[PDB]
Amino acid sequence: LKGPELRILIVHARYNLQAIEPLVKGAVETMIEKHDVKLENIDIESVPGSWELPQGIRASIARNTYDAVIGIGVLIKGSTMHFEYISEAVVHGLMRVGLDSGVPVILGLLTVLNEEQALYRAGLNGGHNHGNDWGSAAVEMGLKAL
Amino acid sequence: LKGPELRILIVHARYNLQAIEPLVKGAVETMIEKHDVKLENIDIESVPGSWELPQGIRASIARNTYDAVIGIGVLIKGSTMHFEYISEAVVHGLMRVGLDSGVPVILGLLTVLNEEQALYRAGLNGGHNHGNDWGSAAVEMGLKAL
Amino acid sequence: LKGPELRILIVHARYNLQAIEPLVKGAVETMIEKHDVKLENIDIESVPGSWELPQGIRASIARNTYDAVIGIGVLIKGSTMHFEYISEAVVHGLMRVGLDSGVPVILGLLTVLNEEQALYRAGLNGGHNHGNDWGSAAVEMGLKAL
Amino acid sequence: LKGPELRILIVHARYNLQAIEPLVKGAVETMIEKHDVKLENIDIESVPGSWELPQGIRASIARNTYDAVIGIGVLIKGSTMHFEYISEAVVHGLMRVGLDSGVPVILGLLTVLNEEQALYRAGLNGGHNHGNDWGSAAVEMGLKAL
Amino acid sequence: LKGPELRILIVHARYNLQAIEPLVKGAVETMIEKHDVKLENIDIESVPGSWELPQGIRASIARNTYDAVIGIGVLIKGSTMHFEYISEAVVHGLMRVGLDSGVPVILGLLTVLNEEQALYRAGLNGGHNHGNDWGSAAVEMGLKAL
Ligand SMILES: Cc1cc2nc3c(=O)[nH]c(=O)nc-3n(C[C@H](O)[C@H](O)[C@H](O)CO)c2cc1C
Ligand SMILES: Cc1cc2nc3c(=O)[nH]c(=O)nc-3n(C[C@H](O)[C@H](O)[C@H](O)CO)c2cc1C
Ligand SMILES: Cc1cc2nc3c(=O)[nH]c(=O)nc-3n(C[C@H](O)[C@H](O)[C@H](O)CO)c2cc1C
Ligand SMILES: Cc1cc2nc3c(=O)[nH]c(=O)nc-3n(C[C@H](O)[C@H](O)[C@H](O)CO)c2cc1C
Ligand SMILES: Cc1cc2nc3c(=O)[nH]c(=O)nc-3n(C[C@H](O)[C@H](O)[C@H](O)CO)c2cc1C
């Protein structure tokens, strides 16, 4: 699968930048090197945290045109019930933005119990980088949408 | 119940292809052999994973016309809360696509604790193939929609 | 409360027909014998399972005109998480169909732990038939809608 | 805060009339005696149970015009999962009706473990009547909407 | 990041004023002193409780024009299931108001187990004031929306 003409959007939160950078990297790397996506055709915006992910994406979708978008963020279970309610709302929200707009939104949200689980899924400490998978999913959904 | 004229869509994810193939097979087999559905009248698309099921279906529904569609995928509980939030969002999303479009969407999503439970419901190891049930449900809902 | 002119719809699933029949019976019986609903003014459709309840109702609401509708089905906790996610989606969906259409939808969905609990609520083994209650609720909501 | 011109709607379910009456009383009493709401400007409808609360309100909102509405009902945990799914759907539904219509909907739904907890929140056995609070909330939201 | 021209709205509930005031303070303080927001450009409304947060915001968004809004409130787990259902509905609702309007809504809702956890997140007893974070998030989302 190659998408030389595909325009892709990547909105990521800023908390847990240690797990987030590897995630974004893998996504970009994979699209460029495996699906022939052009670097200039990849916009990368950012928002304070995961809560702003759905709106950040919705705003950008209104401005320019993209074939696919990837929402990236990591939520870690804390002492309160915050984790549970935000996770549910954000996941439901990304799903909504995608269905409302007709633009494929790939879920790059990690909802873990601790930092280790997040880093592991970002490719560190012997884990597999899930950003790569999201990159290929973006490309694939982008093409099927044409 | 026979649906010789029915056009049916089947979108399935690709993770856990071991449980997914049997599922799709049973669905197709059942429609052809028990409800007289014509093989040429059955489109089979695929997406990376369960998260893309709702959008994959919505896109296809916009292109061609179908009397019913079956969303197939299997989610397995992992170490994080991922399983819980995606399961809820995907199920809610397939329900939405169906009600929004007026096209019957049959739920072929397995949300299990482990691989064994999935294979069991795919007809292996003495279990009953649920794909068969989904096939008959598609045919029935398709006819009642006419 | 009497509704001689009321037209009522009853869509029921087919799994657990042992608990479902008593449920439907009580609903019909109650409407006829206590609220003067005319037998000819009661349509009874059916769908494979509870998942199709929302769409089955939405389709029918589009065809003919009804003053109230009753969605009947029984979900039993199983080995997987299926029970939990379907229950939530179906209940949320019936609520949606009702609010979207303006037509009162009475919830006749039983979400139990085992078969016994269902039969008990269907009037068997010393229990009270909840179908009766749903019948009266349909009639009442139908009238208040006029 | 005084609302002599405010028109307020109160829809309440009928199950657990022992806890419900005190609740409604407190709401009305409080509005009349503390916010100068006129008794003639307070409509009080009723529905069979909590499930019908959202639709009962939506129907009335379509007929007449109100500045605020209070949904009152009490759900008690039972032997099945019924309590959990209905509670979630009803709460989500009242929230929806309010946001869809632009009319403030005050939540007067009690979701308790047992009858005692409900009566306690209805002002009995040394508890505080929450109906009073809902009455003041209705008045306040009604005014801010003008 | 500076937003001298930004107009920001802050709607807060009134229960737990001990935790709420510090929260609002930190938000305002941070915007003024770190992002050059003008005090006259910050409206501060209030509602009885967290349930009214979504509607309170929706009403105000309809009146005047803002670049961002912050919903502040604190919910504390009690004896009943109330906490759980309201938390979920309010969080889902704030998310909806934001996506429906196109106006960024920052979540300043604390869903804690006890009063201590709330005060801690309000900057007291050695904790970090989260109002500051919400203030910066509002400013940032406000600018990116232009
Ligand atoms: C107590 C608390 C914990 C938070 N934890 C996270 C987290 O783990 N990941 C994340 O992206 N954002 C987190 N956020 C920020 C949240 O996503 C959101 O951006 C804010 O509530 C709105 O700015 C947290 C906010 C608060 C108040
Ligand atoms: C940590 C993790 C676990 C996943 N588990 C599953 C699974 O069990 N089944 C499935 O269809 N997709 C799974 N997916 C992929 C998911 O459905 C979805 O496709 C992606 O998040 C978007 O490409 C998983 C993704 C991640 C990051
Ligand atoms: C594993 C499994 C368990 C099911 N259990 C029920 C049940 O208890 N009640 C019911 O009405 N339908 C049940 N269904 C069918 C479901 O409501 C729905 O009809 C299908 O997924 C779509 O045809 C089940 C389906 C599956 C695959
Ligand atoms: C098994 C069962 C338990 C119920 N429990 C309550 C309850 O505690 N409170 C209430 O207002 N309604 C209750 N209802 C009725 C429900 O709100 C709703 O009105 C019906 O399902 C639709 O008429 C119950 C209905 C059933 C079938
Ligand atoms: C039993 C009960 C507990 C409540 N607890 C809270 C709370 O912890 N925080 C809050 O902002 N509002 C709380 N509220 C009020 C709620 O947010 C809402 O304003 C009302 O139900 C509508 O006025 C509570 C209301 C009730 C009846």
Nearest to A109 by CA among A99, A126, A127, A122: A122
Which own/partner pairs from E31-36 qualify as long-range (CB within 8 Å, at least 24 positions apart)? Answer: E31/E3, E31/E135, E31/E136, E31/E138, E31/E139, E34/E135, E34/E136, E35/E1, E35/E2, E35/E3, E35/E6, E35/E135, E35/E136, E35/E139, E36/E2, E36/E3, E36/E4
- Which residues of chain E make contact with A49, given a CB cutoff of 8 A? 137
- In this structure, which ligand is nearest to the CA of C98? 4
Contact, B112 vs C81, CB < 8 A?
Answer: yes
Atom nearest to D108 CA in ligand 5: 21
CA distance E27 to E29: 6
CA C105 to ligand 4 centroid distance, Å = 13
Technique of determination:
X-ray
Beta strands in chain A (DSSP E): 8-12, 42-46, 68-76, 105-112
Catalytic residues of B: 82
CA distance A120 to E123: 32
Facing residue for E54 by CB, picked from D99, D111, D112: D99
For residue B11, the domain's CATH number is: 3.40.50.960
Contact, C85 vs C122, CB < 8 A?
Answer: no
- Which residues of chain E make contact with D125, given a CB cutoff of 8 A? none
Q: Determine the structural domain holding residue E18 and report its residue range.
A: 1-146
Q: DSSP of A47-75, one letter per residue?
A: -SSGGGHHHHHHHHHHHS--SEEEEEEEE
- Which residues of chain D make contact with C30, given a CB cutoff of 8 A? none
Separation in Å, CA of B55 to nearest CA in chain A? 6
CA distance D13 to A19: 50
CA distance E54 to E97: 7
Can you give chain E as a three-state secondary structure string?
Answer: CCCCCCCEEEEEECCCHHHHHHHHHHHHHHHHHHHCCCHHHEEEEEECCHHHHHHHHHHHHHHCCCCEEEEEEEEECCCCCHHHHHHHHHHHHHHHHHHHHCCCEEEEEEEECCHHHHHHCECCCCCCEHHHHHHHHHHHHHHHCC
Resolution in angstroms for this experimental structure?
2.8
Contact, B94 vs B109, CB < 8 A?
Answer: yes
Facing residue for E137 by CB, picked from A48, A62, A97: A48
Nearest to D6 by CA among D66, D89, D73: D66
Tokens of B30: 């059942």
> Could you tell me if the CB of D138 is within 6 A of ligand 4?
no
Contact, B13 vs B50, CB < 8 A?
Answer: yes
A130 a catalytic residue: no
Q: DSSP of D19-79, one letter per residue?
A: HHHHHHHHHHHHHHHHH---GGGEEEEEESSGGGHHHHHHHHHHHS--SEEEEEEEEE--S
Tokens of D124: 């009995």
Facing residue for B145 by CB, picked from C59, C81, C82: C59
What interhelical angle do E82-101 and A82-101 show, nearest 10?
A: 30
Question: Which residues have C-beta within 8 Å of that of residue A110, sequence separation ≥ 6?
Answer: A19, A23, A73, A74, A75, A117, A118, A121, A122, A130, B80, B82
**Half-sphere exposure (Cβ direction) of E30: Cα atoms closer than 13 Å:** 20
CB-based touch E/C (3+ pairs, under 8 A):
no
Domain count of the fold of chain A: 1
